[PDB]
Amino acid sequence: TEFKAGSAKKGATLFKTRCLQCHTVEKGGPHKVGPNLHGIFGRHSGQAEGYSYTDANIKKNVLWDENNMSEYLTNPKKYIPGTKMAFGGLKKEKDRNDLITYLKKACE
Amino acid sequence: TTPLVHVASVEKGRSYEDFQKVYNAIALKLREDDEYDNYIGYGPVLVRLAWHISGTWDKHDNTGGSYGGTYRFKKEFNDPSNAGLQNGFKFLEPIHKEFPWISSGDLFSLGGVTAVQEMQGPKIPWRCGRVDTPEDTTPDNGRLPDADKDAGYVRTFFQRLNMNDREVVALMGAHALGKTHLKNSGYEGPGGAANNVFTNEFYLNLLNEDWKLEKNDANNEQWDSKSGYMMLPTDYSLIQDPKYLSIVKEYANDQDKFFKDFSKAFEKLLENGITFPKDAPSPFIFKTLEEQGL
Ligand code: HEC
Ligand code: HEC
C-alpha cells in the first residue's frame, strides 16, 4: 500500500477537530450527522444500519481500505459524486496518514 | 456640495490575470494554514473581515465602506466590535507584501470573495478599483451591528446598507461559518457541524434544531442546542419574524437559490459606495484552485 503510517496521536487530534462533529468511533456509537465509523474498514460503503445514506454512497459499494479512504478524504465529492458529506478535505498527505492510522485503531 | 463620490480606479497596468494570482496567493495560504482556530481555517474570519470593512458604510452620506481601506488605521483596527479580526489582517499582510500595488480595500474584499469560493461556496463576481484614503476618512466606532437585539433592530440597521429583507437573510447565512469566541464577542460555540464549508446549514439548523435561551460563562444570553450549536439573539430573530421566516424556509429547501442570492447580496455589500465608470472592466470571476487542477 502507498499508505505509509502516521501518528495515531496526531490523528486523534485531527479526528476530534475535523471529524468528531459528525462521526463517532466506538462500538454503539450514536448515528449523528454522519454514520458511526466503528468497523468501517472491511466493509462496503453505505452498509451500516440505522443511518440514512445517499443513493450515490450506497451505489459506490467500495470495499474500504487505507488507500481508497485516502482518495475519499482528499476530495469527498470527487471520489463519490453526489455525497452529502460536507467536508473540504485533507489536502496534506501527513494528515491523511495520521488520521487513517488513528481511525484504524479506533474502528477496531 | 454633495457628499463624497468614490470612483473606481483600476490599479495601474493590472488586469484579470494579476488579480487571479492574488486570488491563488490567498487560496494557497488557506490550505497551508489549515490548522488555525482548531482546524477551522482562516476561511470564516476572512469573510467576517470583508463584511466588517464593508459594514461601516452609510448610504446617507457615503461615509465608511470598503473603498478607503481605512481599517488599516488604529481607530477602526481596535474597534471593540472588530475583536479577532487581527488574525485576518495578519493573514493578508504577507500577501500585501507580495503584491504591494493592490489597495487595502481590494485586498480585504478579495479575501472575502476568495475563501467563500474555496469553501465550495457560490462564485462571487468581484471588481477592482478601490483607492486608499487618508486617516481622517476613517469612520467612528459603533457602525457595526449589535448581537443582542431583535428582528426590528436587524431590519432597521441593514436599511443603512441599502439591504432588503431578502438581502439580509441570504447574507446572514454566512453565520454557518466558523464560530463565536467568548474572548472576542462574549459568545461561544459554532452554529452547526459544518463551519468551514459553505452550505445552507444555518437555515436548516435554525428550523430543525431545538433551541433554548441560556446564559454562558460571560453572563451573556445565547440560544444553545442539544447538539451543541449556538445562535445569536439576532440570528434567532429570523425565525421570530414572519417575513424573515418565509425566506429562511426558502433557503433551507433550496441551497441553489441561497447561493445565487448570497452571491448578489455579498458583492453588493463589498461594492457599496463605489462608483464604477462606464469604461470600467466587467466584474472578475476567478477560477478556484480545484478548477486550476489542484
Ligand atoms: C459533517 C459535517 C461531516 C464531516 C465534518 C465529516 N463527515 Fe464523513 N460523512 C458525513 C456524512 C453526511 C456521510 C454520508 C454521505 C453519504 O452520501 O451518505 C459521511 C460518510 C463518511 C464515510 C463513509 C461511510 C460509509 O461508507 O459507510 C466515511 C468513511 C467518513 N464519512 C469519514 C469521515 C472522516 C474520516 C472525516 C474527517 C476527517 C469526516 N468523515 C468528516 C458527515 C461528515
Ligand atoms: C456576509 C457575512 C456576515 C454578515 C453579513 C454578518 N456576519 Fe457575523 N460573522 C461572519 C462570519 C464568517 C463569522 C465567524 C468568524 C470566525 O469564525 O472567525 C462572524 C462572527 C460574528 C460574531 C463573533 C465574532 C467572534 O470572533 O467572536 C459576532 C458577534 C457577529 N458575527 C455578529 C453579527 C451581527 C450582529 C450581524 C448582523 C446583524 C452579522 N454578524 C452579520 C460573517 C457575517
CSV table of C-alpha atoms and ligand atoms in Angstrom, one decimal:
chain,number,residue,atom,x,y,z
A,1,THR,CA,0.0,0.0,0.0
A,2,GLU,CA,1.2,3.5,-0.8
A,3,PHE,CA,-0.3,4.5,2.5
A,4,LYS,CA,2.6,4.5,4.9
A,5,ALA,CA,1.9,5.2,8.5
A,6,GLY,CA,1.4,8.3,10.7
A,7,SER,CA,0.9,9.3,14.3
A,8,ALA,CA,-2.2,7.9,16.0
A,9,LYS,CA,-1.8,10.8,18.5
A,10,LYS,CA,-1.8,13.5,15.8
A,11,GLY,CA,-4.7,11.6,14.1
A,12,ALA,CA,-6.6,11.7,17.3
A,13,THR,CA,-6.4,15.5,17.5
A,14,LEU,CA,-7.2,15.5,13.7
A,15,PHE,CA,-10.4,13.5,14.3
A,16,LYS,CA,-11.7,15.4,17.3
A,17,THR,CA,-11.4,18.7,15.3
A,18,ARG,CA,-12.3,17.7,11.7
A,19,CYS,CA,-14.4,14.6,12.1
A,20,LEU,CA,-15.9,14.3,15.6
A,21,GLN,CA,-18.7,16.8,14.9
A,22,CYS,CA,-20.3,14.3,12.5
A,23,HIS,CA,-18.7,11.0,13.4
A,24,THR,CA,-18.4,8.7,16.5
A,25,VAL,CA,-16.0,5.8,16.5
A,26,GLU,CA,-16.7,3.5,19.5
A,27,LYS,CA,-19.0,0.5,19.4
A,28,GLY,CA,-22.6,1.5,20.0
A,29,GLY,CA,-21.6,5.0,18.8
A,30,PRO,CA,-24.7,7.0,18.0
A,31,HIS,CA,-25.7,8.0,14.5
A,32,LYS,CA,-25.3,11.7,14.2
A,33,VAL,CA,-24.9,13.8,11.1
A,34,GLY,CA,-22.7,11.1,9.7
A,35,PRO,CA,-22.8,7.3,10.4
A,36,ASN,CA,-20.9,5.5,13.2
A,37,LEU,CA,-17.5,4.7,11.8
A,38,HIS,CA,-16.8,1.6,14.0
A,39,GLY,CA,-15.6,-1.2,11.8
A,40,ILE,CA,-15.7,1.0,8.7
A,41,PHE,CA,-12.6,-0.9,7.3
A,42,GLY,CA,-13.5,-4.3,5.9
A,43,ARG,CA,-17.0,-3.1,5.0
A,44,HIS,CA,-18.5,-1.8,1.8
A,45,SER,CA,-19.8,1.8,1.6
A,46,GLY,CA,-23.2,2.7,3.0
A,47,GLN,CA,-24.0,-0.5,4.8
A,48,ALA,CA,-24.2,0.5,8.5
A,49,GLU,CA,-27.9,0.0,9.5
A,50,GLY,CA,-29.8,2.8,11.3
A,51,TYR,CA,-28.2,5.5,9.1
A,52,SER,CA,-29.8,7.1,6.0
A,53,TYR,CA,-27.2,7.2,3.3
A,54,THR,CA,-27.4,8.9,-0.1
A,55,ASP,CA,-28.1,6.7,-3.2
A,56,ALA,CA,-24.6,7.6,-4.5
A,57,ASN,CA,-22.9,6.4,-1.3
A,58,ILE,CA,-24.6,3.0,-1.5
A,59,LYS,CA,-24.2,2.6,-5.2
A,60,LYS,CA,-20.5,3.3,-4.9
A,61,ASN,CA,-20.2,0.0,-3.0
A,62,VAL,CA,-16.5,0.4,-2.3
A,63,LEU,CA,-14.6,-2.0,0.0
A,64,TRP,CA,-13.0,0.5,2.3
A,65,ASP,CA,-9.3,0.2,2.9
A,66,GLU,CA,-6.5,2.7,3.8
A,67,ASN,CA,-5.9,3.6,0.1
A,68,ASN,CA,-9.4,4.4,-1.3
A,69,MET,CA,-10.1,6.1,2.0
A,70,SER,CA,-7.1,8.4,1.2
A,71,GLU,CA,-8.7,9.3,-2.1
A,72,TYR,CA,-12.1,9.9,-0.5
A,73,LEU,CA,-10.8,12.1,2.4
A,74,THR,CA,-8.7,14.1,-0.1
A,75,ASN,CA,-11.8,15.2,-2.0
A,76,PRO,CA,-15.1,13.5,-0.8
A,77,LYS,CA,-17.3,14.7,-3.7
A,78,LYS,CA,-14.9,13.8,-6.5
A,79,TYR,CA,-14.3,10.3,-5.3
A,80,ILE,CA,-18.1,9.9,-4.8
A,81,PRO,CA,-20.2,12.4,-6.8
A,82,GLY,CA,-23.5,13.2,-5.0
A,83,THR,CA,-22.3,12.5,-1.5
A,84,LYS,CA,-23.8,14.7,1.3
A,85,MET,CA,-20.6,14.7,3.4
A,86,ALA,CA,-19.8,18.4,3.6
A,87,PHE,CA,-16.0,18.2,4.0
A,88,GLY,CA,-13.3,20.3,2.4
A,89,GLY,CA,-10.7,17.5,2.5
A,90,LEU,CA,-7.3,16.5,4.0
A,91,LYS,CA,-5.1,18.2,1.4
A,92,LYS,CA,-2.0,17.2,3.3
A,93,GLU,CA,-0.5,13.7,3.0
A,94,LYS,CA,0.7,13.7,6.6
A,95,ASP,CA,-2.8,14.5,7.9
A,96,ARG,CA,-4.2,11.7,5.8
A,97,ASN,CA,-1.6,9.2,7.1
A,98,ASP,CA,-2.0,10.4,10.7
A,99,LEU,CA,-5.8,10.2,10.7
A,100,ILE,CA,-6.1,6.8,8.9
A,101,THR,CA,-3.6,5.5,11.4
A,102,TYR,CA,-5.9,6.7,14.2
A,103,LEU,CA,-9.1,5.5,12.6
A,104,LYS,CA,-7.7,2.0,12.1
A,105,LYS,CA,-7.1,1.8,15.9
A,106,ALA,CA,-10.5,3.4,16.7
A,107,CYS,CA,-12.5,1.4,14.2
A,108,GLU,CA,-11.4,-1.9,15.9
B,1,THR,CA,-21.6,70.4,-2.2
B,2,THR,CA,-23.0,66.9,-2.3
B,3,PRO,CA,-21.3,64.0,-0.3
B,4,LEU,CA,-18.2,62.2,-1.5
B,5,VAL,CA,-18.2,60.1,-4.6
B,6,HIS,CA,-15.7,57.2,-4.7
B,7,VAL,CA,-14.7,56.4,-8.3
B,8,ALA,CA,-13.3,53.0,-9.1
B,9,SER,CA,-9.7,53.4,-10.2
B,10,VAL,CA,-8.1,50.3,-11.8
B,11,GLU,CA,-4.6,49.5,-10.4
B,12,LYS,CA,-2.1,50.9,-13.0
B,13,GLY,CA,-1.3,48.2,-15.5
B,14,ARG,CA,-3.2,45.4,-13.8
B,15,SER,CA,-5.7,43.1,-15.3
B,16,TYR,CA,-7.6,39.8,-14.7
B,17,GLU,CA,-4.5,37.6,-14.6
B,18,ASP,CA,-2.9,39.8,-12.0
B,19,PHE,CA,-5.9,39.6,-9.7
B,20,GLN,CA,-6.2,35.9,-10.3
B,21,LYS,CA,-2.7,35.5,-8.9
B,22,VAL,CA,-3.7,37.4,-5.8
B,23,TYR,CA,-6.6,35.0,-5.5
B,24,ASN,CA,-4.3,32.0,-5.8
B,25,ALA,CA,-2.0,33.5,-3.2
B,26,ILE,CA,-4.9,33.8,-0.8
B,27,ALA,CA,-6.3,30.4,-1.7
B,28,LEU,CA,-3.0,28.6,-1.2
B,29,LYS,CA,-2.2,30.1,2.2
B,30,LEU,CA,-5.7,29.0,3.1
B,31,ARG,CA,-4.6,25.4,2.6
B,32,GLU,CA,-1.2,25.7,4.2
B,33,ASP,CA,-2.5,27.5,7.3
B,34,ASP,CA,-5.3,24.9,7.8
B,35,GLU,CA,-4.6,24.3,11.5
B,36,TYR,CA,-5.8,27.8,12.6
B,37,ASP,CA,-8.6,28.1,15.1
B,38,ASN,CA,-8.6,24.3,15.8
B,39,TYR,CA,-8.6,23.4,12.1
B,40,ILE,CA,-11.5,25.7,11.2
B,41,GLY,CA,-9.0,27.6,8.9
B,42,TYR,CA,-8.7,31.2,8.1
B,43,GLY,CA,-11.8,31.0,5.9
B,44,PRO,CA,-14.6,32.4,8.1
B,45,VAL,CA,-12.6,35.2,9.7
B,46,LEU,CA,-11.6,36.4,6.2
B,47,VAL,CA,-15.2,36.8,5.1
B,48,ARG,CA,-16.0,38.3,8.5
B,49,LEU,CA,-13.2,40.8,7.7
B,50,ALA,CA,-14.7,41.7,4.4
B,51,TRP,CA,-18.1,42.1,6.0
B,52,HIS,CA,-16.9,44.4,8.8
B,53,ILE,CA,-14.9,46.6,6.4
B,54,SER,CA,-18.0,47.0,4.2
B,55,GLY,CA,-20.5,47.2,7.0
B,56,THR,CA,-19.2,50.6,8.1
B,57,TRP,CA,-20.9,52.1,5.1
B,58,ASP,CA,-23.6,54.8,5.4
B,59,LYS,CA,-25.9,55.3,2.4
B,60,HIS,CA,-26.9,58.8,3.6
B,61,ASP,CA,-23.5,60.4,3.1
B,62,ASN,CA,-21.4,57.6,1.6
B,63,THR,CA,-19.1,57.5,4.6
B,64,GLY,CA,-17.4,54.3,5.6
B,65,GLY,CA,-17.5,51.4,3.1
B,66,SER,CA,-14.7,49.2,1.9
B,67,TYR,CA,-13.4,51.7,-0.7
B,68,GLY,CA,-11.0,53.6,1.6
B,69,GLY,CA,-9.5,50.6,3.2
B,70,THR,CA,-9.4,52.7,6.4
B,71,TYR,CA,-9.4,49.5,8.6
B,72,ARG,CA,-5.6,49.7,8.3
B,73,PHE,CA,-5.8,52.6,10.8
B,74,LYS,CA,-5.8,52.0,14.6
B,75,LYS,CA,-9.1,53.7,15.2
B,76,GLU,CA,-11.0,51.1,13.2
B,77,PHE,CA,-8.5,48.4,13.9
B,78,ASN,CA,-9.2,48.4,17.6
B,79,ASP,CA,-13.0,48.7,17.4
B,80,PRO,CA,-14.4,46.5,20.2
B,81,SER,CA,-16.8,45.0,17.6
B,82,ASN,CA,-13.8,44.1,15.5
B,83,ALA,CA,-12.1,41.8,18.1
B,84,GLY,CA,-10.5,38.9,16.5
B,85,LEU,CA,-10.1,40.4,13.0
B,86,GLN,CA,-6.4,41.0,13.6
B,87,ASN,CA,-5.8,37.4,12.7
B,88,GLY,CA,-7.4,38.2,9.3
B,89,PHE,CA,-5.2,41.3,8.7
B,90,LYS,CA,-2.1,39.4,9.7
B,91,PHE,CA,-3.1,36.7,7.3
B,92,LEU,CA,-3.3,39.1,4.4
B,93,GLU,CA,-0.1,41.0,5.4
B,94,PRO,CA,2.4,38.8,3.6
B,95,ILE,CA,0.0,38.7,0.6
B,96,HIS,CA,0.0,42.5,0.6
B,97,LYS,CA,3.8,42.4,0.8
B,98,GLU,CA,3.9,40.1,-2.3
B,99,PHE,CA,1.5,42.4,-4.2
B,100,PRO,CA,2.3,45.9,-2.9
B,101,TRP,CA,0.4,47.5,-5.8
B,102,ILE,CA,-3.0,46.3,-4.7
B,103,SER,CA,-5.1,48.6,-2.5
B,104,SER,CA,-6.1,47.6,1.1
B,105,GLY,CA,-9.8,47.7,0.1
B,106,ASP,CA,-9.4,45.5,-2.9
B,107,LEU,CA,-7.3,43.0,-0.9
B,108,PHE,CA,-9.7,42.8,2.1
B,109,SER,CA,-12.8,42.3,-0.1
B,110,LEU,CA,-11.0,39.8,-2.3
B,111,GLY,CA,-10.0,37.8,0.8
B,112,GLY,CA,-13.8,37.7,1.4
B,113,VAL,CA,-14.6,36.5,-2.1
B,114,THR,CA,-11.7,34.0,-2.2
B,115,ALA,CA,-12.5,32.0,0.9
B,116,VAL,CA,-16.2,31.7,0.1
B,117,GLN,CA,-15.3,30.1,-3.3
B,118,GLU,CA,-12.6,28.0,-1.7
B,119,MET,CA,-15.0,26.8,0.9
B,120,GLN,CA,-17.1,25.4,-2.0
B,121,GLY,CA,-19.5,28.4,-2.0
B,122,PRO,CA,-21.0,30.2,-5.0
B,123,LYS,CA,-18.9,32.1,-7.4
B,124,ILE,CA,-18.9,35.8,-6.4
B,125,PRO,CA,-18.1,38.5,-9.1
B,126,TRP,CA,-15.5,41.0,-7.9
B,127,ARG,CA,-14.4,44.3,-9.2
B,128,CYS,CA,-11.1,46.1,-8.6
B,129,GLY,CA,-10.6,49.8,-8.5
B,130,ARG,CA,-10.7,50.8,-4.8
B,131,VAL,CA,-8.3,53.5,-3.6
B,132,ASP,CA,-6.7,54.1,-0.2
B,133,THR,CA,-7.9,57.2,1.6
B,134,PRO,CA,-6.3,59.3,4.5
B,135,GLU,CA,-6.6,58.5,8.2
B,136,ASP,CA,-9.2,61.3,8.7
B,137,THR,CA,-11.6,59.4,6.5
B,138,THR,CA,-11.7,56.6,9.0
B,139,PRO,CA,-15.3,56.3,10.4
B,140,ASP,CA,-16.1,56.3,14.1
B,141,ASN,CA,-16.8,53.1,16.1
B,142,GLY,CA,-20.4,51.9,16.6
B,143,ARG,CA,-21.4,51.5,12.9
B,144,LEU,CA,-21.4,47.7,13.2
B,145,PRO,CA,-24.4,45.7,14.3
B,146,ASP,CA,-25.2,44.6,17.9
B,147,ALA,CA,-25.7,40.8,18.6
B,148,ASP,CA,-28.1,41.1,21.5
B,149,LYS,CA,-31.2,42.6,19.7
B,150,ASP,CA,-34.3,41.5,17.9
B,151,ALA,CA,-35.7,41.4,14.3
B,152,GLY,CA,-36.8,45.0,14.3
B,153,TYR,CA,-33.2,46.1,15.1
B,154,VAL,CA,-31.8,44.0,12.3
B,155,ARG,CA,-34.1,45.2,9.6
B,156,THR,CA,-33.7,48.8,10.7
B,157,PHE,CA,-29.9,48.5,10.8
B,158,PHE,CA,-29.5,47.0,7.4
B,159,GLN,CA,-31.5,49.8,5.9
B,160,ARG,CA,-28.3,51.8,6.2
B,161,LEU,CA,-26.6,49.3,3.9
B,162,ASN,CA,-29.5,49.5,1.3
B,163,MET,CA,-30.3,45.9,2.0
B,164,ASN,CA,-33.8,44.5,1.9
B,165,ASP,CA,-35.4,41.5,3.7
B,166,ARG,CA,-34.3,39.0,1.0
B,167,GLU,CA,-30.8,40.5,1.1
B,168,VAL,CA,-30.2,40.2,4.8
B,169,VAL,CA,-31.4,36.6,5.2
B,170,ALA,CA,-29.1,35.5,2.5
B,171,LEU,CA,-26.1,37.4,4.0
B,172,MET,CA,-26.9,36.0,7.5
B,173,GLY,CA,-26.4,32.5,6.2
B,174,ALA,CA,-22.7,33.2,6.5
B,175,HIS,CA,-23.1,32.5,10.2
B,176,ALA,CA,-22.9,28.8,9.4
B,177,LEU,CA,-19.2,29.5,9.0
B,178,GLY,CA,-16.7,29.4,11.9
B,179,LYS,CA,-17.8,30.2,15.4
B,180,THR,CA,-18.3,32.8,18.1
B,181,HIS,CA,-15.3,33.3,20.5
B,182,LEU,CA,-16.0,34.3,24.1
B,183,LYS,CA,-12.8,36.4,24.3
B,184,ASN,CA,-13.8,38.2,21.2
B,185,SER,CA,-17.6,38.8,21.2
B,186,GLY,CA,-18.8,37.4,24.5
B,187,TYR,CA,-20.5,34.5,22.8
B,188,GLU,CA,-19.3,30.9,22.4
B,189,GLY,CA,-19.8,28.0,20.0
B,190,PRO,CA,-20.4,27.0,16.4
B,191,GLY,CA,-23.8,27.3,14.5
B,192,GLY,CA,-23.5,23.8,13.1
B,193,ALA,CA,-21.4,20.8,12.4
B,194,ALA,CA,-20.0,22.2,9.1
B,195,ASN,CA,-18.4,25.6,9.7
B,196,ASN,CA,-15.6,25.7,7.1
B,197,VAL,CA,-17.7,24.6,4.1
B,198,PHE,CA,-20.2,27.0,2.6
B,199,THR,CA,-23.7,25.4,2.8
B,200,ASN,CA,-27.3,26.4,3.8
B,201,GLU,CA,-26.8,24.7,7.2
B,202,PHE,CA,-27.6,28.0,9.0
B,203,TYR,CA,-31.2,27.9,7.8
B,204,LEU,CA,-31.7,24.1,8.4
B,205,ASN,CA,-30.3,24.2,11.9
B,206,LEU,CA,-32.5,27.3,12.6
B,207,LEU,CA,-35.6,25.3,11.8
B,208,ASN,CA,-34.7,21.7,12.7
B,209,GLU,CA,-32.7,22.1,15.9
B,210,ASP,CA,-34.4,22.7,19.3
B,211,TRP,CA,-33.0,26.0,20.8
B,212,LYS,CA,-33.1,27.1,24.4
B,213,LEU,CA,-32.1,30.6,25.6
B,214,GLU,CA,-29.3,30.3,28.2
B,215,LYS,CA,-26.6,32.3,29.9
B,216,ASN,CA,-23.0,31.5,29.0
B,217,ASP,CA,-19.8,32.0,31.1
B,218,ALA,CA,-19.7,35.6,30.0
B,219,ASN,CA,-23.1,36.3,31.6
B,220,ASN,CA,-24.5,37.0,28.1
B,221,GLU,CA,-27.5,35.3,26.6
B,222,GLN,CA,-27.3,33.0,23.6
B,223,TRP,CA,-29.5,30.2,22.1
B,224,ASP,CA,-28.0,26.8,22.5
B,225,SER,CA,-29.0,23.4,21.0
B,226,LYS,CA,-28.8,19.9,22.4
B,227,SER,CA,-26.5,19.1,19.5
B,228,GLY,CA,-24.1,21.8,20.8
B,229,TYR,CA,-24.8,24.5,18.3
B,230,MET,CA,-25.4,28.2,19.1
B,231,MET,CA,-27.3,31.1,17.7
B,232,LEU,CA,-27.0,34.8,18.5
B,233,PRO,CA,-30.2,36.7,19.5
B,234,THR,CA,-30.2,38.4,16.1
B,235,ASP,CA,-29.8,35.1,14.3
B,236,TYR,CA,-32.8,33.6,16.2
B,237,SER,CA,-34.8,36.7,15.4
B,238,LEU,CA,-35.0,35.4,11.8
B,239,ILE,CA,-37.5,32.7,12.7
B,240,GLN,CA,-39.3,35.0,15.1
B,241,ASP,CA,-40.2,37.4,12.3
B,242,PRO,CA,-42.8,36.0,9.9
B,243,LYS,CA,-41.3,37.7,6.8
B,244,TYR,CA,-37.8,36.6,7.7
B,245,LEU,CA,-39.2,33.1,8.5
B,246,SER,CA,-40.6,32.7,4.9
B,247,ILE,CA,-37.2,33.4,3.4
B,248,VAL,CA,-35.4,31.2,5.9
B,249,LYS,CA,-37.6,28.2,4.9
B,250,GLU,CA,-37.0,29.1,1.2
B,251,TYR,CA,-33.2,28.9,1.5
B,252,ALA,CA,-33.5,25.8,3.7
B,253,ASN,CA,-35.1,23.8,0.9
B,254,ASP,CA,-33.2,25.5,-1.9
B,255,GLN,CA,-29.4,25.9,-1.4
B,256,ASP,CA,-29.2,26.8,-5.1
B,257,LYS,CA,-31.4,29.8,-4.5
B,258,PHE,CA,-29.4,30.6,-1.4
B,259,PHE,CA,-26.1,30.6,-3.4
B,260,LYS,CA,-27.3,32.9,-6.2
B,261,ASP,CA,-28.9,35.3,-3.7
B,262,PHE,CA,-25.9,35.3,-1.4
B,263,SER,CA,-23.6,36.0,-4.4
B,264,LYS,CA,-25.6,39.0,-5.3
B,265,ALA,CA,-26.0,40.5,-1.9
B,266,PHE,CA,-22.4,39.8,-0.9
B,267,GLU,CA,-21.0,41.6,-4.0
B,268,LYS,CA,-23.3,44.5,-3.4
B,269,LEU,CA,-22.1,44.7,0.2
B,270,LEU,CA,-18.4,44.9,-0.9
B,271,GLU,CA,-19.2,47.4,-3.6
B,272,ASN,CA,-21.5,49.7,-1.7
B,273,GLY,CA,-20.4,53.3,-2.0
B,274,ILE,CA,-18.3,52.7,-5.1
B,275,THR,CA,-19.0,54.4,-8.4
B,276,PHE,CA,-17.8,52.3,-11.4
B,277,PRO,CA,-17.1,54.3,-14.5
B,278,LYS,CA,-18.5,53.4,-18.0
B,279,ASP,CA,-15.0,52.3,-19.1
B,280,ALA,CA,-14.5,50.1,-16.0
B,281,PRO,CA,-13.7,46.4,-16.7
B,282,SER,CA,-16.6,43.9,-16.3
B,283,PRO,CA,-16.6,42.1,-12.9
B,284,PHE,CA,-14.0,39.3,-12.4
B,285,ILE,CA,-14.9,35.7,-11.8
B,286,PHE,CA,-11.8,33.8,-10.6
B,287,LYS,CA,-11.5,30.0,-11.0
B,288,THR,CA,-10.9,28.0,-7.9
B,289,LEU,CA,-7.7,26.1,-7.1
B,290,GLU,CA,-9.7,23.0,-7.7
B,291,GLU,CA,-10.7,24.4,-11.1
B,292,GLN,CA,-7.0,25.0,-11.6
B,293,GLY,CA,-6.2,21.3,-11.2
B,294,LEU,CA,-5.2,21.5,-7.6
C,1,HEC,C1,-20.3,16.6,8.6
C,1,HEC,C2,-20.2,17.9,8.9
C,1,HEC,C3,-19.2,15.6,8.3
C,1,HEC,C4,-17.8,15.8,8.5
C,1,HEC,C5,-17.1,17.0,9.0
C,1,HEC,C6,-17.2,14.5,8.1
C,1,HEC,N1,-18.2,13.6,7.7
C,1,HEC,FE1,-17.9,11.8,7.0
C,1,HEC,N2,-19.9,11.6,6.5
C,1,HEC,C7,-20.8,12.6,6.7
C,1,HEC,C8,-22.0,12.3,6.0
C,1,HEC,C9,-23.3,13.1,6.0
C,1,HEC,C10,-21.7,10.9,5.3
C,1,HEC,C11,-22.7,10.2,4.4
C,1,HEC,C12,-22.5,10.7,2.9
C,1,HEC,C13,-23.5,9.9,2.0
C,1,HEC,O1,-23.5,10.3,0.8
C,1,HEC,O2,-24.2,9.1,2.5
C,1,HEC,C14,-20.4,10.6,5.6
C,1,HEC,C15,-19.7,9.5,5.2
C,1,HEC,C16,-18.4,9.1,5.6
C,1,HEC,C17,-17.8,7.8,5.4
C,1,HEC,C18,-18.4,6.6,4.6
C,1,HEC,C19,-19.3,5.8,5.5
C,1,HEC,C20,-19.7,4.6,4.7
C,1,HEC,O3,-19.5,4.5,3.5
C,1,HEC,O4,-20.4,3.7,5.3
C,1,HEC,C21,-16.6,7.8,5.9
C,1,HEC,C22,-15.5,6.7,5.9
C,1,HEC,C23,-16.4,9.1,6.6
C,1,HEC,N3,-17.6,9.8,6.4
C,1,HEC,C24,-15.3,9.5,7.3
C,1,HEC,C25,-15.0,10.8,7.7
C,1,HEC,C26,-13.8,11.3,8.1
C,1,HEC,C27,-12.5,10.5,8.4
C,1,HEC,C28,-13.9,12.7,8.4
C,1,HEC,C29,-12.9,13.7,8.9
C,1,HEC,C30,-11.6,13.5,9.0
C,1,HEC,C31,-15.3,13.0,8.0
C,1,HEC,N4,-15.9,11.9,7.6
C,1,HEC,C32,-15.8,14.3,8.1
C,1,HEC,C33,-20.6,13.7,7.5
C,1,HEC,C34,-19.4,14.3,7.8
C,2,HEC,C1,-21.5,38.3,5.0
C,2,HEC,C2,-21.0,37.9,6.1
C,2,HEC,C3,-21.6,38.3,7.5
C,2,HEC,C4,-22.6,39.1,7.9
C,2,HEC,C5,-23.5,40.0,6.9
C,2,HEC,C6,-22.7,39.2,9.3
C,2,HEC,N1,-21.7,38.3,9.8
C,2,HEC,FE1,-21.3,37.9,11.8
C,2,HEC,N2,-19.6,36.8,11.3
C,2,HEC,C7,-19.4,36.3,10.0
C,2,HEC,C8,-18.5,35.2,10.0
C,2,HEC,C9,-18.0,34.4,8.8
C,2,HEC,C10,-18.2,35.0,11.5
C,2,HEC,C11,-17.2,33.9,12.1
C,2,HEC,C12,-15.8,34.5,12.1
C,2,HEC,C13,-14.8,33.4,12.6
C,2,HEC,O1,-15.3,32.2,12.6
C,2,HEC,O2,-13.7,33.7,12.9
C,2,HEC,C14,-18.9,36.0,12.2
C,2,HEC,C15,-18.9,36.2,13.6
C,2,HEC,C16,-19.7,37.1,14.3
C,2,HEC,C17,-19.5,37.4,15.7
C,2,HEC,C18,-18.5,36.8,16.7
C,2,HEC,C19,-17.1,37.2,16.2
C,2,HEC,C20,-16.1,36.5,17.2
C,2,HEC,O3,-14.9,36.4,16.8
C,2,HEC,O4,-16.5,36.1,18.3
C,2,HEC,C21,-20.5,38.3,16.0
C,2,HEC,C22,-20.7,38.9,17.4
C,2,HEC,C23,-21.3,38.6,14.8
C,2,HEC,N3,-20.7,37.8,13.8
C,2,HEC,C24,-22.3,39.4,14.7
C,2,HEC,C25,-23.0,39.8,13.6
C,2,HEC,C26,-24.2,40.5,13.5
C,2,HEC,C27,-25.0,41.0,14.8
C,2,HEC,C28,-24.6,40.6,12.2
C,2,HEC,C29,-25.8,41.3,11.6
C,2,HEC,C30,-26.8,41.9,12.3
C,2,HEC,C31,-23.6,40.0,11.4
C,2,HEC,N4,-22.6,39.5,12.3
C,2,HEC,C32,-23.6,39.9,10.1
C,2,HEC,C33,-20.0,36.9,8.8
C,2,HEC,C34,-21.0,37.8,8.7
